[PDB]
Amino acid sequence: FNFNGLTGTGVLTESNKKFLPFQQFGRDIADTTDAVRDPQTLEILDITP
Amino acid sequence: GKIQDSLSSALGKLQNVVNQNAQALNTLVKQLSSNFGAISSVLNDILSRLDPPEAEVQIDRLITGRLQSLQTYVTQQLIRAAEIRASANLAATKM
Amino acid sequence: LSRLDPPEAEVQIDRLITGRLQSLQTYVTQQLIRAAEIRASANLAATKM
Amino acid sequence: RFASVYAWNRKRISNCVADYSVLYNSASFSTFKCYGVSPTKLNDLCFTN
Amino acid sequence: AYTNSFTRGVYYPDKVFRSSVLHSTQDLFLPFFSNVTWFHANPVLPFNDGVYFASTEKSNIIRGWIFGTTLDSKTQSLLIVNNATNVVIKVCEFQFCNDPFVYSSANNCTFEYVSKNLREFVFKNIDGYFKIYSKHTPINLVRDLPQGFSALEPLVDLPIGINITRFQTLLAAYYVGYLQPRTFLLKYNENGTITDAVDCALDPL
């Protein structure tokens, strides 16, 4: 996948984390991308590996 | 009846070996975001703004650093396992 | 540092850094191996006492 | 009208869609030299600024 | 007068969600327990590195700020206004009243835009970008600086390029802090909001 710059690989899944209206994406400890927001529909999706 | 109170209300030697292993595993992952003297920490960024003859020199700088960090992790685990082994050998004698 | 300009000096300073960091890792690894030998001896002393 | 070299202009690009292939093959530029990236991979990158 | 902030002027350093994670940052913050000027009702202040700015009322006496280096013509400046209608950002070369509360010139405009209470704002200006964070909390007082924790969420972003060295206020009680490079430890909730913080240069603890 590529989300307007974020390049990665994995399974995408519907989220339930309330991304504050101003947060582009999530991030877990040890600093790995684990959630994104779809630019067009603006919904949060988890990125399992 | 008092053991039960004093515990229900001390397992630091068991907590410390858990903590040490987690602190080492986190340091291993947190090294995947250092340059070691390169333009970035991402291979999809050296493979996107450099031609193959110039990206070799930048990929090798990451390879060397990451190998060093993995091998440091593996040495300190050998030294920590040799200490857990002696404790288990004492526990087997006490049993 | 006073006989080269930065682009030229950073190359040599990185070699110096690499060597000096290797020396310190060798030192610390051997102190770790030598302290586990002193601990096995103090454990024998405690049992003797 | 361009600006003089001693007080040069600086235009900042914002959110857009940029097409650098029409600039790389314009055949009117006397010098097109890219430094931090190969030119042919210009159309696929998202420069924060 | 001068007053003491307690734990005030914390903003989200950027996008990127986040949950329970005592995350550590280096940035420009308002140090804890600081010496914030007090103003009643005003004069030309400095900027020098960002600004914290709170205000208290039920009516609306505070009607925006004006920024820049000279606050006149011969150099460019920003102007942020709010009549009883709505906000009006604007960037021209102006001629500002030395005690303004309208202007007297609007030349060469390079950017336009049109459309009790405690209202905090953090203004900063980096790489030709003028960032504005803000928060609106309800006090149960009228016009004194309270105590508590409340993180400020980013509002705007303007790619101007403008130089800034001075700023003012516009009126129809307010404070002014300044920001320095500090290191903080932010505690993130499970919804991803900053609930507490630690200023790591206030003492040995």
Ligand SMILES: *[C@@H]1O[C@H](CO)[C@@H](O[C@@H]2O[C@H](CO)[C@@H](O)[C@H](O)[C@H]2NC(C)=O)[C@H](O)[C@H]1NC(C)=O
């Ligand atoms: C981007 O554009 C798409 C359409 O191209 C928008 O999708 C619309 O979403 C609304 C939901 O509020 C639907 O009612 C419409 O029917 C959708 N249109 C189509 C053609 O499917 C989408 O909302 C836009 N992005 C944003 C952030 O608004």
Ligand SMILES: *[C@@H]1O[C@H](CO)[C@@H](O)[C@H](O)[C@H]1NC(C)=O
């Ligand atoms: C703030 O600084 C001024 C400078 O003279 C000083 O007089 C005042 O006491 C200080 N206020 C606090 C709360 O330290």
Ligand SMILES: *[C@@H]1O[C@H](CO)[C@@H](O)[C@H](O)[C@H]1NC(C)=O
């Ligand atoms: C509010 O002020 C702006 C500043 O130019 C102006 O454009 C607008 O017309 C004003 N509102 C009304 C209702 O006139």
Ligand SMILES: *[C@@H]1O[C@H](CO)[C@@H](O)[C@H](O)[C@H]1NC(C)=O
């Ligand atoms: C700015 O305004 C002045 C006076 O109106 C004018 O002389 C000057 O040309 C303007 N700037 C530009 C870039 O045109």
Ligand SMILES: *[C@@H]1O[C@H](CO)[C@@H](O)[C@H](O)[C@H]1NC(C)=O
């Ligand atoms: C802001 O002012 C400084 C004065 O030292 C000047 O050097 C600088 O060029 C100005 N900013 C811009 C974007 O020109």
Ligand SMILES: *[C@@H]1O[C@H](CO)[C@@H](O)[C@H](O)[C@H]1NC(C)=O
């Ligand atoms: C926000 O956080 C609260 C407490 O941390 C929690 O109860 C709630 O489910 C979260 N989500 C909301 C309010 O949407």
